[PDB]
């Protein structure tokens, strides 16, 4: 079954089903078990596309659509539900950190040469 002939450049080369080199029989006496090749038999145009190291076309126990549903369904929950917590965080019913010396602004980088209005507090 030669490749479709429409401005494609493959011509004589035949359509090869998406069978990766990992998918082929690992128990066969392959001449080149590196990617499970043999001698003389035809080779896929995108052979290096689907080799054991690279992408693989092998059966999975459960349908690819299922991954798509869980992977989308799984990940979509947090950033949604984590968006909700962006409005609703958690903390302890404890007041702010009232601080001496105008709230560190003397020594918290802020320039004190300009009038550093002293924000002081008292034990309520």
Partner 1 sequence: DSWDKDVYPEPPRRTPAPAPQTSLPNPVTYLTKIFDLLVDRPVTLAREFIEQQHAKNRYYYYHREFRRVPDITECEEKDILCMFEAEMQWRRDYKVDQEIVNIIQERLKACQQREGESYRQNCAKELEQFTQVSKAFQDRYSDLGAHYSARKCLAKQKQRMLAERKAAKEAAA
Partner 2 sequence: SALLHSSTMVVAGVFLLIRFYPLMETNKLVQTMTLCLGAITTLFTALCAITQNDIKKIVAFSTSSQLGLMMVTIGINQPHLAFLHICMHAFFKAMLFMCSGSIIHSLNDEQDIRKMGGLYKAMPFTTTALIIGSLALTGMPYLTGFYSKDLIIEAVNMSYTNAWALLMTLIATSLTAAYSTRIIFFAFLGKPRFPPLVLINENNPLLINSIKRLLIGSIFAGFIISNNIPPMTVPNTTMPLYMKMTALIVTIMGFMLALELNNTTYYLKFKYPSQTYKFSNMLGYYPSIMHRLPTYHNLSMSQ
Partner 3 sequence: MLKIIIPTTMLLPMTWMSKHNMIWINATVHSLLISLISLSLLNQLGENSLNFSLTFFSDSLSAPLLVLTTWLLPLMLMASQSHLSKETTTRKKLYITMLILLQLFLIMTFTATELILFYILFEATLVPTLIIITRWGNQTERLNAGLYFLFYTLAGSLPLLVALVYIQNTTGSLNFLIIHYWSHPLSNSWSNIFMWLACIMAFMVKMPLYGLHLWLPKAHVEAPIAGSMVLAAVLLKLGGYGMMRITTILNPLTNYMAYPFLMLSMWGMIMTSSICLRQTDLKSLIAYSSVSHMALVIVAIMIQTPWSFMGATALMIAHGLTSSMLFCLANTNYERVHSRTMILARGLQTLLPLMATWWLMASLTNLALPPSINLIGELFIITASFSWSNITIILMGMNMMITALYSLYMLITTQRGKYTHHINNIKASFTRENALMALHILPLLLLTLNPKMILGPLY
User: Smallest distance from the beta carbon of 31 to partner 3, in angstroms?
Assistant: 7
Whether residue 38 contacts residue 68, with contact meaning beta carbons closer than 8 Å, is answered with no
Binding of partner 3 at residue 38 (CB under 8 A)? no
Binding of partner 3 at residue 32 (CB under 8 A)? yes
Q: What residue 34 binds from partner 3, ligand MYR, partner 1, none (CB within 5 to 8 A, per partner kind)?
A: partner 3
Whether residue 38 contacts residue 32, with contact meaning beta carbons closer than 8 Å, is answered with yes
Binding of partner 3 at residue 18 (CB under 8 A)? no
Breaks (C-N over 2.5 A) in the chain follow: none
Give the binding site for partner 3 (CB under 8 A). 31-34, 47-49, 53
């Amino acid at each position: 079954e030669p490749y479709p002939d429409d401005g494609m450049g493959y011509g004589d080369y035949p359509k090869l089903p998406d069978r990766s080199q990992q998918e082929r029989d690992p128990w066969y006496d392959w001449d080149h078990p590196d990617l499970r090749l043999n001698w003389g038999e035809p080779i896929h145009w995108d052979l290096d596309m689907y080799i054991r190291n690279r992408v693989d076309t092998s059966p999975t126990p459960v349908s690819w659509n299922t991954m798509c549903k869980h992977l989308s369904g799984f990940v979509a929950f947090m950033l949604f539900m984590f968006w909700v917590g962006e409005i609703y965080p958690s903390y302890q019913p404890v007041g702010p950190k009232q601080y001496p010396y105008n709230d560190l602004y003397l020594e918290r980088g802020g320039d004190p040469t300009k009038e550093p209005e002293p924000v002081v507090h008292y034990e309520i």
